[PDB]
Design a protein around this ligand. Structure first.
Ligand SMILES: CCn1cnc2c(Nc3ccc(P(=O)(O)CP(=O)(O)O)cc3)nc([C@H]3CC[C@H](N)CC3)nc21
Length: 261
């Protein structure tokens, strides 16, 4: 086994939070004292190894802005026990009645937190590869944590969120994640709308190659859109670092938009 293994009896699945095709997510209790989240595996869907590699990545990462792994049960049905995030998906949140009231300051702040989680990823020499709102979890007090580390890997695919060079040539770097982050900014500034409204995957790929970039979302300051465009520079190395993005977003209302309403 490994040091992250826990007896299945020390878990108590309670509310089914969600369900996918790989299995489902449950809010439960661990050791009778701890509130947790449990990701289960549907026995046929994917190999134990394939499902658990997400947990393999999480054993090497630990940051306040990344969903924390608590333990695993590696005998079918396989379980991945993580910290529980009380508000669920950022996407559902941005879409819901809940998020219809979020204003730019809260939005920029959520971005700053995600950028901080990614800045850790960046300095740990990893690439997430699946960065988008659906993969960010919201908690109490609008705390945003990065989740879904299954595709993440040590730097040894939806064209809408994936950088061109990563989607076309498999060139996955922290800079391709920076591209995804710029797309994630549009999701935050539009209430979770799907990027490139009215364009099919093929049209997106084609258009992005010709230099097309999404225009400034309504109500989004031009300065925040410029940051998005920096995240989408065609040359991966011209794209800002997550360390830069985190600082820029945290200071946004003083250093970039002091006159803000
Ligand atoms: C396993 C990591 N993790 C840790 N916490 C998680 C969580 N929490 C969660 C999701 C939804 C609600 P909710 O429906 O009651 C919210 P509300 O609308 O009443 O405010 C509450 C907690 N949801 C999901 C997953 C679960 C499946 C989903 N497609 C993606 C996130 N994954 C979570």
């Amino acid at each position: 086994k490994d040091a992250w293994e826990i007896p299945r009896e020390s878990l108590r699945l309670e509310v089914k939070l969600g369900q996918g095709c790989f299995g489902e997510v449950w809010m439960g209790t661990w050791n009778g004292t701890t509130r947790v989240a449990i990701k289960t595996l549907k026995p046929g869907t994917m190999s134990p190894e394939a499902f658990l590699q997400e947990a393999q990545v999480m054993k090497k990462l630990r940051h306040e802005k990344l969903v924390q792994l608590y333990a695993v049960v590696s005998e079918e049905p396989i379980y991945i026990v993580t910290e529980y995030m009380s508000k669920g998906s950022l996407l559902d949140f941005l879409k819901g009645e809940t998020g219809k009231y979020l204003r730019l300051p809260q939005l920029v702040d959520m971005a700053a937190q995600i950028a901080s989680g990614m800045a850790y990823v960046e300095r740990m020499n990893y690439v997430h590869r699946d960065l988008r709102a659906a993969n960010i979890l919201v908690g109490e007090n609008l705390v945003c944590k990065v989740a879904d580390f299954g595709l993440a890997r040590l730097i040894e695919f939806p064209i809408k969120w994936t950088a061109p060079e990563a989607a076309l040539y498999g060139r996955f770097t922290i800079k391709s994640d920076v591209w995804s982050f710029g797309i994630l900014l549009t999701e935050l500034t539009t209430k979770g709308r799907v990027p490139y409204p009215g364009m099919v995957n093929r049209e997106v790929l084609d258009q992005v190659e010709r230099g097309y970039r999404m225009p400034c979302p309504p109500e989004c300051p031009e300065s925040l859109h410029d940051l998005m465009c920096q995240c989408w520079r065609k040359e991966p190395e011209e794209r800002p670092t997550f360390e830069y993005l985190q600082a820029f977003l945290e200071d946004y209302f003083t250093s970039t938009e002091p006159q803000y309403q």
